Design an enzyme around this catalytic site. Structure first.
Site, PDB file in Angstrom:
ATOM      1  N   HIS A   1       0.810  -1.206   0.000  1.00 17.67           N
ATOM      2  CA  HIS A   1       0.000   0.000   0.000  1.00 17.67           C
ATOM      3  C   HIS A   1       0.850   1.266   0.000  1.00 17.67           C
ATOM      4  O   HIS A   1       0.517   2.233  -0.677  1.00 17.67           O
ATOM      5  CB  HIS A   1      -0.962   0.007   1.185  1.00 17.67           C
ATOM      6  CG  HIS A   1      -1.833   1.216   1.230  1.00 17.67           C
ATOM      7  ND1 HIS A   1      -1.605   2.288   2.052  1.00 17.67           N
ATOM      8  CD2 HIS A   1      -2.944   1.523   0.516  1.00 17.67           C
ATOM      9  CE1 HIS A   1      -2.560   3.189   1.824  1.00 17.67           C
ATOM     10  NE2 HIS A   1      -3.402   2.772   0.899  1.00 17.67           N
TER      11      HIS A   1
ATOM     12  N   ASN B   1       0.698   3.982  -2.887  1.00 22.35           N
ATOM     13  CA  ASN B   1      -0.017   5.190  -2.482  1.00 22.35           C
ATOM     14  C   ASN B   1       0.720   6.517  -2.236  1.00 22.35           C
ATOM     15  O   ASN B   1       0.272   7.561  -2.701  1.00 22.35           O
ATOM     16  CB  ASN B   1      -0.867   4.870  -1.243  1.00 22.35           C
ATOM     17  CG  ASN B   1      -1.702   6.049  -0.791  1.00 22.35           C
ATOM     18  OD1 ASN B   1      -2.614   6.463  -1.487  1.00 22.35           O
ATOM     19  ND2 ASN B   1      -1.371   6.612   0.369  1.00 22.35           N
TER      20      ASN B   1
ATOM     21  N   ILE C   1      -5.035   5.267   4.962  1.00 23.83           N
ATOM     22  CA  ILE C   1      -5.503   6.299   4.045  1.00 23.83           C
ATOM     23  C   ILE C   1      -5.402   5.892   2.560  1.00 23.83           C
ATOM     24  O   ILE C   1      -5.631   6.762   1.698  1.00 23.83           O
ATOM     25  CB  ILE C   1      -4.775   7.647   4.319  1.00 23.83           C
ATOM     26  CG1 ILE C   1      -5.604   8.819   3.778  1.00 23.83           C
ATOM     27  CG2 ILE C   1      -3.351   7.605   3.792  1.00 23.83           C
ATOM     28  CD1 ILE C   1      -4.962  10.143   3.964  1.00 23.83           C
TER      29      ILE C   1
HETATM   30  O1  LIG Z   1      -7.469   5.337   0.756  1.00 18.01           O
HETATM   31  C1  LIG Z   1      -7.920   5.715  -0.451  1.00 18.01           C
HETATM   32  C2  LIG Z   1      -8.240   7.046  -0.679  1.00 18.01           C
HETATM   33  C3  LIG Z   1      -8.796   7.434  -1.899  1.00 18.01           C
HETATM   34  O2  LIG Z   1      -9.060   8.748  -2.114  1.00 18.01           O
HETATM   35  C4  LIG Z   1      -9.041   6.479  -2.890  1.00 18.01           C
HETATM   36  C5  LIG Z   1      -8.671   5.127  -2.651  1.00 18.01           C
HETATM   37  C6  LIG Z   1      -8.127   4.756  -1.437  1.00 18.01           C
HETATM   38  O3  LIG Z   1      -8.793   4.215  -3.662  1.00 18.01           O
HETATM   39  C7  LIG Z   1      -9.451   4.465  -4.894  1.00 18.01           C
HETATM   40  C8  LIG Z   1      -8.338   5.088  -5.757  1.00 18.01           C
HETATM   41  C9  LIG Z   1      -8.608   5.509  -7.061  1.00 18.01           C
HETATM   42  C10 LIG Z   1      -7.629   6.177  -7.802  1.00 18.01           C
HETATM   43  O4  LIG Z   1      -7.896   6.595  -9.051  1.00 18.01           O
HETATM   44  C11 LIG Z   1      -6.376   6.419  -7.260  1.00 18.01           C
HETATM   45  O5  LIG Z   1      -5.442   7.105  -7.960  1.00 18.01           O
HETATM   46  C12 LIG Z   1      -6.103   5.985  -5.978  1.00 18.01           C
HETATM   47  O6  LIG Z   1      -4.865   6.151  -5.453  1.00 18.01           O
HETATM   48  C13 LIG Z   1      -7.083   5.332  -5.248  1.00 18.01           C
HETATM   49  C14 LIG Z   1     -10.600   5.455  -4.522  1.00 18.01           C
HETATM   50  O7  LIG Z   1     -11.481   5.663  -5.602  1.00 18.01           O
HETATM   51  C15 LIG Z   1      -9.879   6.786  -4.125  1.00 18.01           C
HETATM   52 FE   LIG Z   2      -5.063   4.122   0.266  1.00 18.31          FE
END
Ligand SMILES: Oc1cc(O)c2c(c1)O[C@H](c1cc(O)c(O)c(O)c1)[C@H](O)C2
Ligand SMILES: [Fe+2]
EC number: 1.13.11.58
Length: 849
Positions: free
Chosen positions: A701, A705, A849
């Site tokens: 992660h 991330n 997060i």
């Molecule tokens: O903890 C988190 C926080 C977030 O705001 C998001 C998470 C997980 O995962 C998906 C996601 C979509 C993307 O397109 C990304 O670029 C991304 O990193 C993560 C979600 O829809 C946006």
């Molecule tokens: Fe995340």
């Protein structure tokens, strides 16, 4: 007669809740550690407010059960303790105990105060031959009338499912029972019930037909992991779809509070797509703000001068907690964004073919590349022709100025690599291109240069229906160019690959492989392993704040009106496609070593450092992560063999066996009949399974991330959607590449409004809270009295510190420039420790997060 001395440590709601913590708009890493015994508001817990009742661990009653030792109410505040923390309040309590009424091992607590509090710990200063008996609690205690059963807490010592102390065997099976909950009703705030449910919360049929979304999980077409059950009534216009809500349930204790204001990074998201997105959409639908960037110079002005906003919005967002600093503003009219590490040294190096191929190895999405074994690349699609054909990249498109040798030689020597983004999008390319978005099904070949650097060879831009469908092979390949229109064409060819890659990274690499996949384990663990269980203690920290972020996700990120559907290529079909990709997910293949082998980036070699040989050894993600995965694998092994004397000992563990059964058959139930699931019958199987869980929650992660804003903070480097097809022949758009290629680029990628939403979201996601617990030997207190596990953990933290130093030295090694590249961005994504802000480093224990 006799009185055992107790010290109760707790934290008032006011110290941990956001609405009240609105007053911590500054640094509170301490600040006197105000005990509460200060400005005595803590007398309220002194009346007949809180009662504790000790339970015996060595002396049972008539029918099984342990023995209760009277209810005792709190008394006096201990104004200061050497081990007292900020926001914490300590109280003294003397329990009447007496031998024959054995040694304590658990206790019931009753809160009569109405307003709940966070019980930290309890410590008893015994009578027989025992030192202090410590109870690590970390749980919110609500008023006693709404539970049916008293809140019970166990002592330090970890015991196997034997449940060990016979007097507590009943109390263990019962607490666990209460954690499950029958599977009925609408879940409430104060509840601690863990259960499963499919993804039927994302859409909203009641508001329309266009607002409905497919149910994910529980079917063949869209298989998906389960998420935490919440009990809202079905939607009026659809019984299999659950009604929406501004407040989603998750078991209490799973929702972590904070001392400081800007550490509520979840309230940041919830407030952005709520009071920042609706307002900004009105700034564009006016004229105070231009709807499209005119040049590259205008996009950069985002980190310098910023976007001069109107006070009709810029002060309506200014107060808003957690959004302190992030949304920089020179006062009035200006919504600035901090500069990403990608442009700090050089703002033009992101355009090089080197910082395009480099990012596939040390980027935001570095685990997708693979060694080509037999050219040309093939599709894994069905009777649709090209899926039975292959790629239209001829053996004549490869080998430019670099070296120059044959195709087969480059493969027998493993220098050719692929970055395939064809299959996942092709099936929905017809539907997606029929909207404001226009995308391609991309394929790109890379060559391993003599100097270790990777270089793009050919980019294949595919489209569906060459004429009808059954063929789909309607593609065109583009080659690298450095001047004229050919270079402005190649620059766009890369923008078409990146738009595909960032979206795959969107819901799969980040949301699916991490967030969604992990939730079922949290539920299975809490429902079947007692807090006293060894595996429960090993896993626990790596689940921190995970059900909370995924709850917000279903609410504001991956839902119908969501932020992910507005900013990404897949759009409305976003999650569905991740359900499709989920069909290919294999648990054991998530293990870093197994992943490297599967993509062909490594070959087994015992003569090598970690039992595997790497093709392209100048691979930061892989090379650094292999050290970390190893550290995890050694720690889990030391820890598991510490408790299990043999394999049979494992097979006869009713708690772990019931946990694994349910995780397989229910948690990830759509894959229950899959043969690759480890059958908990071996100790090295539990070792492997736990190592993959921890790897996923922390190191995987982190890598995927925290480099989101540093790399993708420049919408130019990592665009999220494309609006135009490639300019052709003599069109006014082909000629526009000639006149103003920057406008051409800007009109082909994410428009301004969605660029501003993307940046304000990945910027929150890319930050560490000041109270984050990292992998680096980090835990909160003293989770166990087992000295051997305590030492094994100290050993874990030590190797994490060596690895940190070890990783810094590689970044300084001038010979490994894939770590920095033309952009001079040392790959520090995999370094264990980190400080608060937007540091391009730090491995948290879990998905926080
Ligand atoms: O903890 C988190 C926080 C977030 O705001 C998001 C998470 C997980 O995962 C998906 C996601 C979509 C993307 O397109 C990304 O670029 C991304 O990193 C993560 C979600 O829809 C946006
Ligand atoms: Fe995340």
């Amino acid at each position: 007669g006799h009185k055992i001395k107790g010290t109760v440590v707790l934290m008032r709601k006011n110290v941990l809740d956001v609405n009240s913590v609105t007053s911590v708009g500054g640094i509170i890493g301490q600040g006197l550690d105000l005990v509460g015994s200060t400005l005595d508001t803590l007398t309220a817990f002194l009346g007949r407010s809180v009662s504790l009742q000790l339970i015996s661990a060595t002396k049972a009653d008539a029918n099984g059960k342990g023995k209760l030792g009277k209810a005792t109410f709190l008394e006096g505040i201990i104004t200061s303790l050497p081990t007292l923390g900020a926001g914490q309040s300590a109280f003294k309590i003397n329990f009447e105990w007496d031998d024959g009424s054995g040694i304590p091992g658990a206790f019931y607590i009753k809160n009569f105060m109405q307003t709940e509090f966070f019980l930290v710990s309890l410590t008893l200063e015994d009578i027989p031959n025992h030192g202090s008996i410590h109870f690590v609690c970390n749980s919110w205690i609500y008023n006693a009338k709404l539970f049916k059963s008293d809140r019970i807490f166990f002592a330090n010592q970890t015991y196997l499912p034997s449940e060990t102390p016979a007097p507590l065997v009943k109390y263990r099976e019962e607490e666990l029972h209460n954690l499950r909950g029958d599977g009925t009703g609408e879940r409430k705030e104060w509840e601690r019930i863990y259960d499963y449910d499919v993804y039927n919360d994302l859409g909203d049929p009641d508001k329309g037909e266009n607002h409905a979304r497919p149910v994910l999980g529980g079917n063949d077409t869209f298989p998906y992991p389960r998420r935490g059950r919440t009990g809202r009534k079905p939607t009026r216009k659809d019984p299999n779809s659950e009604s929406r809500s501004n407040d989603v349930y998750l078991p209490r204790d799973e929702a972590f509070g904070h001392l400081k204001s800007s550490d509520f990074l979840t309230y940041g998201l919830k407030s952005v797509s709520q009071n920042v997105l609706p307002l900004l959409q009105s700034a564009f639908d006016l004229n105070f703000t231009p709807r499209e960037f005119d040049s590259f110079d205008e996009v950069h002005g985002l980190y310098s001068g910023g976007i001069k906003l109107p006070t009709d919005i810029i002060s309506k967002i200014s107060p808003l907690p957690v959004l302190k600093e992030i949304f920089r503003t020179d006062g009035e009219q200006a919504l600035k964004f901090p500069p990403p590490k990608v442009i700090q040294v050089s703002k033009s190096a992101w355009m090089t073919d080197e910082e395009f191929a480099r990012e596939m190895l040390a980027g935001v999405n570095p685990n997708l590349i693979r060694c080509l074994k037999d050219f040309p690349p093939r599709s894994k699609l069905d009777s649709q022709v090209y899926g039975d054909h292959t790629s239209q990249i001829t053996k004549e498109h490869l080998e430019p100025n670099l070296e120059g040798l044959t195709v087969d030689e480059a493969i027998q020597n493993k220098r050719l690599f692929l970055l395939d983004h064809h299959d996942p999008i092709m099936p929905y390319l017809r539907r997606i291109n029929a909207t404001s978005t226009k995308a391609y099904a991309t394929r790109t070949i890379l060559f391993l240069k003599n100097d270790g650097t990777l270089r793009p060879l050919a980019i294949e831009l595919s489209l569906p229906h060459p004429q009808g469908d059954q063929s789909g092979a309607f593609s065109q390949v583009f080659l690298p160019a450095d001047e004229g229109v050919e270079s402005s064409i190649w620059l766009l060819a890369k923008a078409y690959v990146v738009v595909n890659d960032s979206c795959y990274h969107q819901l799969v690499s980040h949301w699916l492989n991490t967030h969604a996949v992990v939730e079922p384990f949290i539920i299975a663990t809490n429902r079947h392993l007692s807090v006293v269980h060894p595996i429960y203690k090993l896993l626990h920290p790596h689940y921190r704040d995970t059900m909370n972020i995924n709850g917000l996700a279903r609410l504001s990120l991956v839902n119908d009106g969501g932020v992910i559907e507005q900013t990404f290529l897949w759009g409305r079909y976003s999650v569905e496609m991740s359900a499709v990709v989920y069909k290919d997910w294999v648990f054991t293949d998530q293990a870093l070593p197994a992943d490297l082998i599967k993509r062909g980036m490594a070959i087994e070699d015992p003569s090598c450092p970690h039992g595997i040989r790497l093709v392209i050894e100048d691979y930061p993600y892989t090379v650094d992560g292999l050290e970390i995965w190893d550290a995890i694998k050694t720690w889990v092994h030391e820890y598991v063999f510490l408790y299990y004397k043999s394999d049979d000992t494992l097979r006869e563990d009713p708690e772990l066996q019931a946990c694994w059964k349910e995780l397989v058959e229910v948690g990830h139930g759509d894959k229950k009949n899959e043969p690759w699931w480890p059958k908990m019958q071996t100790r090295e199987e539990l070792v492997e399974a736990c190592a993959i869980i921890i790897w996923t929650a922390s190191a995987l992660h982190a890598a995927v991330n925290f480099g989101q804003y540093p790399y993708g903070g420049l919408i130019l480097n990592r665009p999220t959607l494309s609006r135009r097809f490639m300019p052709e022949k003599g069109s006014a758009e082909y000629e526009e590449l000639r006149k103003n290629p920057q406008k051409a680029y800007l009109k082909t990628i994410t428009p301004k409004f969605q660029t501003l939403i993307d940046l304000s979201v990945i910027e929150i996601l890319s930050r560490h809270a000041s109270d984050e617990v990292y992998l680096g030997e980090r835990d909160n207190p003293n989770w166990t009295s087992d000295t051997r596990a305590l030492e094994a953990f100290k050993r874990f933290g030590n190797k994490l510190a060596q690895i940190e130093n070890k990783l810094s030295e590689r970044n300084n090694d001038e010979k490994l420039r894939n770590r920095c590249g033309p952009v001079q961005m040392p790959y520090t994504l995999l370094l264990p420790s980190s400080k608060e802000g937007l540091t391009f480093r730090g491995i948290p224990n879990s998905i926080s997060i």
